[PDB]
Amino acid sequence: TQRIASHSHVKGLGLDESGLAKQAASGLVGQENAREACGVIVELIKSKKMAGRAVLLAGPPGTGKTALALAIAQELGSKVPFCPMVGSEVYSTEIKKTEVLMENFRRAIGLRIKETKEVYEGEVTELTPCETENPMGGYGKTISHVIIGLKTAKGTKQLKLDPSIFESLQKERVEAGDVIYIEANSGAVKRQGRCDTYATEFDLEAEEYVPLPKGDVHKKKEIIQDVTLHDLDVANARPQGGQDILSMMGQLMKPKKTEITDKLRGEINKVVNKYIDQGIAELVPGVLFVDEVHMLDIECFTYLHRALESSIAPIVIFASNRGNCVIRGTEDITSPHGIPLDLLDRVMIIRTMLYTPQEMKQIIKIRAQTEGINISEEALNHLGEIGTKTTLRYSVQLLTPANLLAKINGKDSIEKEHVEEISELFYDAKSSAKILADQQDKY
Amino acid sequence: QRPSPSGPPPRCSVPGCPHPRRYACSRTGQALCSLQCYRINLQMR
Amino acid sequence: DVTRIERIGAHSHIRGLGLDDALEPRQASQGMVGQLAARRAAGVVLEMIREGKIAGRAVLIAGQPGTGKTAIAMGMAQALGPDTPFTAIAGSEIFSLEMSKTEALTQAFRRSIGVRIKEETEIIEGEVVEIQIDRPATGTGSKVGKLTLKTTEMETIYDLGTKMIESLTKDKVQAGDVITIDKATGKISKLGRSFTRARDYDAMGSQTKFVQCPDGELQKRKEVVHTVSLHEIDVINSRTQGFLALFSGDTGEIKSEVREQINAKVAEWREEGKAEIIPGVLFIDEVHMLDIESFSFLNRALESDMAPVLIMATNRGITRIRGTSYQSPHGIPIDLLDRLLIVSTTPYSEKDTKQILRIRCEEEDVEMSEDAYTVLTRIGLETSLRYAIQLITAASLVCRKRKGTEVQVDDIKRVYSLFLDESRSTQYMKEYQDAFLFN
Amino acid sequence: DVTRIERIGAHSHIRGLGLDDALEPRQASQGMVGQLAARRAAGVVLEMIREGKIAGRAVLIAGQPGTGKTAIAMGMAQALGPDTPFTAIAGSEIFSLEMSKTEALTQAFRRSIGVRIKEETEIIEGEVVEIQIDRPSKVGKLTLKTTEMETIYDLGTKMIESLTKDKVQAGDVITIDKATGKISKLGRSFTRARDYDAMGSQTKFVQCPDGELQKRKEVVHTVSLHEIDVINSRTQGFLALFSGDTGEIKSEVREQINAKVAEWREEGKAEIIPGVLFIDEVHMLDIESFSFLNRALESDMAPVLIMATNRGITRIRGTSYQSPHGIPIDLLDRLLIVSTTPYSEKDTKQILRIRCEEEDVEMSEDAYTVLTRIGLETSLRYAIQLITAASLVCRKRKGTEVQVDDIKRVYSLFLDESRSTQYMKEYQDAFLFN
C-alpha cells in the first residue's frame, strides 16, 4: 500500500453549499476565513474567465498555507493542470532565471485534444498479387491489386490493396508467418516479427517471436490526449525522428535547455487558436503554485510584474513565512513578507493564523488515524499539551516513534508512559537552542 | 503461401518424460531436455 | 462559451489612446480615461513613429506606481496596429546565460526593425484525375511521367519533368486528391480527397475529412506578405541551414561582420524596391533594472541609422543606479537621461478613479449598484487602485454563490473582509512579530 | 597476506549499533562505547527505516567535536546493511559546476529509493566445439560443451548469419539468451591457449562453464529510482550513469517515472524499498538549498534524511542571519534532534581499547592510563592518532608491547593544535599574514 506523507490527509476545503466553512471536514480543521477565501479562488479558477490574477498565502511557520494550497488542487481534481514549484528552482545552470519562470507559466496551461486511431494487424498467411484478364496494350502483364490474408485470435480475412504496397513488402523483410501492422491513416506497413506459433521450428533462432494479435484484424478507437503548451514549445524547439545529420548529431550530443524565442510562443498560440475555433481541442487554464516565494531574486520579481499582466497567464498562488526581511539581490531593502511593495500591490493577500490548544488536539487525532495508530485519551491529552508548549509539527512528529516503542514493549496503542519516554529521546528547536547557548564555547 | 506446421511439438526421448526438446545429444543423437535426461539417456544406451 | 488562449487580463480593456483628429485627448474613449497630459505626449511620439523618418528617438514615461505608465504603453501599442513591429521586454530579461548583455540589447533592437516583402508566385490548383510514372527496366534512373488535373470548368494533361516527379512520389499523391502546385518553387501541397471517387476503393490507406473540387481557371496567382525582422535575417545568415535557431533561441553572440553585411544588403533591397524597411518600437518596462554597462551601451547604440524608436517606463525616485554607488533620477545615469524626452504622469481623483472602475466592470461582465460603486471608489483611495480593481471579480463570485444578479454593497464589504490590502496585512504582521521569520 | 583495496581507517571497528532486542544499548558491543541515549534514538529511527511506511522523515544529530555523530551514522548504516539503499554525501558536494544545487539534492534523494523487480530468464553458456553449415536457405548445426555435458543444436537461418558476423570458432566460450536471440562471446577456453603464438590486441582466457547447459530461472533485480530517471533522459542516456555527464533531467520525466512505479506496485509487478540519505557536515548547505529541503521532505516517495552538524548558534550561509546549528528555523521544526554528550575517562579508556584491538596493538596498563590523560587534556582524536605512531616507534626499538616511554617519544614529536598554536605565537612575526 501507498506510503504516508506530511499532507496525506488533506482531501478538500470542506465547505457547505453556501460556501461557509465547516469546523472539521475533508481532513482540514479551523482557519475558516482562509478556507472560505480559498473557496472563492477555486470558483475563480473554475470560471475560465481570467488570466494572471494572483494570491499570496501569508502567515507564520506551520499554520497551514501549504495544506490549503494542496487542498485547492483536490477541489479542482486531476483534469486541470496544477504545477508546483519552489522559489529556489529558478537558479538553473543551463538557462536564465526569467526563462525558468516563463516555462512554468506555460506548464500551467493545458490542451485536451481528441482523435481516432485505426490500424490493421495480424499474421500474414498469403501474399497474392492478382493479374487482370488482359494486360494493357503492349504490356506483358498488369496487376490490379494485391491480396493479403491476415489472421488473429478472433478470425481471418483478406485485405485488398494497391499494387504499390508490394515495394514496401520487400523493403521490410516480410515473409509468410510474420505478424505485421498497417496504419490506416497513412498506408505504411511495418513488420513486428515471426509469430510465436513457429518458436519450435529450430533449437535456436536469432529472432524474438511475438504472440498472435487478439481481437479483430481491423481496429478503431477514439482517444483523448492532453498536453501542456510547454510540451508544444519544447517539441517544436528541438525536433525528433531524425534521418539527417542535423538531427542525429543533435541526438548524440548532450541535450540542454535553451532560451525558447518569443516568436515560437507566438506561432504556437496562433495555431492552437485555429483548432479551438474549429472545435477540435479544448483549453484548460490551470494553476501555478510558486511555493517559498521569498527565495526569488529582485530580477525575478521585476519580471513577474510583466508576466502576471499578460492576457495568457495562469492563476498564480504564492506563499511566504517571512516578516520584514531584506529582498534577495539588494543590499539593504527591507520589505513585508520578503517581497517588493510594487509586486505586493498586485496580489490579493489571504492571511493564515496560529492554532489554539483544542485545534492542535483535533489535528493530532486526524494524523494518528491516518498514519494507522491507536492512542488512549490520557496520552492524547499529553501530546496536545506538548504541542501547545512547542509546535504542531514536533507534537505530530512523535506519533510514529511512540507507536514503535509501544510495539517493542508489546502494546497495540500509545499510552502516557510512551510519549513521556519519546520526549526524553528527541529534543525540539526551542530546547536544542537552549543547550547550545549554555555551551557556546564548544561548537 | 503458408505451409502448415506439424501437429505435436517434439518431446524428450527418455520414455517417461513430458518436456519439449531443448537440444540433441552429441553422441547418441537422441532428442533431450535437461542434464537429468542426458545422464539417463547416456546410462541406458 | 468557448475559451481561447487569450483571456481577460490586467490591461485587456485598453484599445488605443482615444485622441481626436486634431490630436487632443477625449475624457473617456477607447478604454482610457483621465491622464490628459501624458496621453497628448504619447500621441506626438506615436505620430513620430508612424512617419519613420528619424532614427534613435527615445522617450521615458515616469510617475507614481499605479498611474497608467504601462497602460499608456499598451494604449499606443494597440493604436500603432499589428503590421508594425512593437517589442516588449522587462529590464530583467537581458541577463542571459547564453550571450552577453550588449548582445541581448543588440538583438532586442534588431528584432524591432521590420523588412517587409511582398511575394507573388503562380500556382496550379486542381483535382488529380490520373498519374502515370514510368521507371526503367534497369537503366540510369531517368523516370518519366504524365499527370492530369481537373476543375469544375476545365481539365488538362501535363508532361512531367524529372526533378518534379520525385516530389509527387515523395508525398504519395494519388487520383482523387486535390492539390496546389507552386511552379517556381517545385513544391506540392494537398487540400484533401474529393468527395466522389473514394467510393470506388481498396482496403483503407487513408481516413480523413473530404474537401470540394476547385472552380474556374486551373492556373492562378497567389500573394503573400512577409514581415521579417533584421534579427531573423542575421540568424538565417549566421550559418548554413540555421533555421531552427529562429524558434530554439540557440544562436549566441552573432559575428559583427554578418550584421554589417546585412545592413548593406537591406539598403540595396530598399533602393531596388524589392523590400520595404519599416521602423518599429522597443518598449523596455522597469528599465531601472539595467546595469551601468547596459546604459553605457545604449548611449552609443542609439546613434545608428538603423535604430528603432525606444520607450521606457519607471516608477523610481532618486535611487542608486544598479551595479554602482551613484544616486541619480529614475535610477538612470545622466549620460542617457540627457539623450531623451521625459513624459510624466499624475495621481488620480475620485472622479476618474470611479470612471476607471466603471470601464473595468464593462470588461469583466459585471453589474453593480451606484451605492456599491460609491463604496468601492472610497476603498480605491483609502488603498491603491489595483486593489479596488481586484475586488470586482471577488465581489461578482460571492454574489453569484448566493444566487444574486447584481453586486450589492454587502458583497463588497464581505470580500473586503476576506482578502487583505497590503497595508492591513502589514499591520497584522506587527502583533505576531516573534512568530514570522527574520524580522 | 595480500593488501586488499580497503584497509583499516577511522570508523572501521564499528560493525553495527550495539542494541538488545528491546533496543536497550549495551555498555560495550559491536565496537561502540557509551552514548546510550543517542544509541536508543538511533535504534528507534532504524526501526522506522526498516518499516518504510512513512515518507519524508528527517533526523538531525548534533553535539560537540569528537563525540560520535558520524560514528553513530556509520554504525547505523551497517546495522541496516546492504539490500536497502544508503547514500552518504558531504554537504559541500552539491555545489556542482554542471547542474544546480536543486538538481544535486534531487538526485541524492532519488538515489536512495530502490525498486525490486522479478524477471523470468533462460540462458545458454558453454564452450563451442564445432560449427557446421551446408548449402542446399542455409542449414547448419552447432555443438556446445560444458564440463558436465556435450550437446548439439539445429540452428536456423538468422543464427547462421549471426555466428559468421561475430566470428565464433572452436574453443570460444559464448552465451545466448534464446528469448532475445543475441550472441555474446566471453573469451577463449584455457584448454586452447596455444593454437596461436601472437594473439590479437584483446583476447581473454576463461574457464569452461559447468552444470546444466540451458539454465532456466527467476532472477530478482534491485535498481535505484535515479537510474530509471537517467535512462529516460536521452537516446543513449545509460552512458551517463558512469560518466556523471547528465544535465538537469526534465521535470516531466521524473513525474512520469513516479506514475509508472506507482502503477507497478498496484499491479504487484514491483515493490518500493525506502532507503536513507545521510548528509554529513550539513551546516554548509546554503539558504536556497535549505528552502528546497522544505518541499523535498513532503513527497509520497522520499528517503529518511539523517544530517549531522557540529555548529553552535551561527550565521546561515548565503545570509546575515544567526540561527541554531547554522540551519533555518523553518527546517529545524520539520526535523527531530538527537544530541550527543562528551565522554568520561571510563569511556575514553574503552574506546582506546577497541582501537588497539582493531589496529592489532598491545599496550601496558600504564601506557593506556597515560594515553587516557593525554586524550582528555586534548582531543580524543589525537589520542587515537598516537597509538599507530607508538607502535611504529616500538617496532624500531625492537620491542613488542607499547610502553609509557613510547607514548612520551611520540608525544614529543607530534604536536596537537593547542601546543602548536602556542609555539606559533612565540615567533609570530616570522609567519605570513597576521
Ligand SMILES: Nc1ncnc2c1ncn2[C@@H]1O[C@H](COP(=O)(O)OP(=O)(O)O)[C@@H](O)[C@H]1O
Ligand atoms: N488546517 C489544517 N487542518 C489539518 N491539518 C493541518 C492544517 N493546517 C496544517 N495542518 C498540518 O500541519 C502541518 C503543517 O502544515 P503546513 O501546510 O506544512 O504549514 P505551513 O505551510 O504553514 O508551514 C502539516 O502536516 C499539515 O498537513
Ligand SMILES: Nc1ncnc2c1ncn2[C@@H]1O[C@H](COP(=O)(O)OP(=O)(O)O)[C@@H](O)[C@H]1O
Ligand atoms: N488612464 C487610465 N485609463 C484606463 N485604465 C487605466 C488608466 N490608468 C491606469 N489604468 C489601469 O489601472 C491599472 C494600473 O495601471 P498600470 O499600467 O498597471 O500602472 P503603472 O504601470 O503606472 O504602475 C491597470 O489595470 C490599467 O489598465
Ligand SMILES: Nc1ncnc2c1ncn2[C@@H]1O[C@H](COP(=O)(O)OP(=O)(O)O)[C@@H](O)[C@H]1O
Ligand atoms: N561511541 C563511540 N564508540 C566508538 N568509537 C567512537 C565513539 N564515538 C566516537 N568514536 C570514534 O572517535 C572518533 C571521532 O568520532 P566522530 O563521530 O567521527 O566525531 P564527530 O562526532 O565530531 O563527527 C572516530 O575515530 C570514531 O570512530
Ligand SMILES: [Zn+2]
Ligand atoms: Zn526429459
